[model samples]
Target: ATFEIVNRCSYTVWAAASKGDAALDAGGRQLNSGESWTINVEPGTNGGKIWARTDCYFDDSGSGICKTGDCGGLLRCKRFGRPPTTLAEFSLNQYGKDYIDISNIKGFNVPMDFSPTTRGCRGVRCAADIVGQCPAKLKAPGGGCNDACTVFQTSEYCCTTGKCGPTEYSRFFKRLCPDAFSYVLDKPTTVTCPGSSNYRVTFCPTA
Candidate 1:
């Protein structure tokens, strides 16, 4: 499988992926506007996440802070990035199927689209102006809109155990992007594709 990560944003974005102990694209990459990075997803690779960090300033050694999605201040991320950023999650070649989903549980920063480039698999997008419309309490200091789970950290919002329902905050997100995982238990948002499919993850996608 292959992942072609594209940046359609007018500004620079740092693309980061977390695949457990395995590093992909050196864990992170910088993408200028209209730039892209094609990554080869080796066979047997399991679950992972892809996201974009914005308004970043890194020194020569790739250490910096981003307004959204900062992963330990390292350009080469070793863990899941901080919240308030959109995420594209995937589990490839699992039981002959590839599971994919776009999640807003952490938060919403950039608009995104995730799709299979080599198959008839359906695509998912979260392009709503969430940051602009975010509620005052859930708004991050920077440019992203944080989720209720991150803002309040209550069981109702986080769903740490089970059987939790949506609140006004989660509904706020769901109303904007029906295809995205608005909360932790948003199971129906997951999509499946062929195991051999190649994918494209676009940031600030127009379509």
Candidate 2:
């Protein structure tokens, strides 16, 4: 099945994803409103992640920048986008099933819907307006929400040392995106489906 990336925002969204083992074409690609892209991926590919970039300005050579989810100034990112970016992680065909989730563990820059186009498969989504109601401490300067781990930088907040669960900070996001991984220890909502299923990931799924 193909992995489809869709943009439904009022503006452009730079979509990014990992190449996994079958690296046909994996990286960042700009998607104007109502635009979509699909790429083939092999089954059981691991460490794959998909995210969106916003507030970007690039040149003809695609060498500019994005306000929130910049990927080291490269349009086709070699690494993951910086924090405060929402993520959809997947491990397809692992243990005979595909694992997927919407993660706010880093933060949220856009609303997303991760749905399988085929039936008999569960879809996970995080469609809340997190940026609009972000807390003062966790708010990004340009747009989007930041995690307490990135904002406060404390052991408790970052969970760098001791065992940590959701804090009042993470709770802010949890309340809005309950199905997502709002923090380090937020309850997991990993959706598992057959490896043969096709999936669509939409940015700003709703207006």
Q: Identify the candidate with maximal TM-score.
A: 1
Residue 24 of model 2 has an lDDT of 27
Residues 147-168, candidate 2: write the lDDT tens digits: 8888888888877876887788
lDDT of 1 at 23: 66
Which regions in candidate 1 have their CA more than 4 angstroms from the true location?
Answer: none
Residue 60 Cα positional deviation in candidate 2, in Å, after optimal superposition:
3.0
Deviating ranges (above 4 Å) for candidate 2? 19-24
Screening candidate 1 with a backbone cut-off below 3 angstroms (N, C-alpha, C), the clashing residue pairs are: none
Indicate which candidate wins on lDDT: 1
Model 1 residue 46 CA deviation (Å) reads: 2.7
Each model's lDDT: 0.89, 0.83
TM-score of 2: 0.92
Instruction: List the pairs of residues colliding in candidate 2.
Output: none
RMSD of 2: 2.0
lDDT of 1 by residue, 13-37 (tens): 9999887575666789899999999
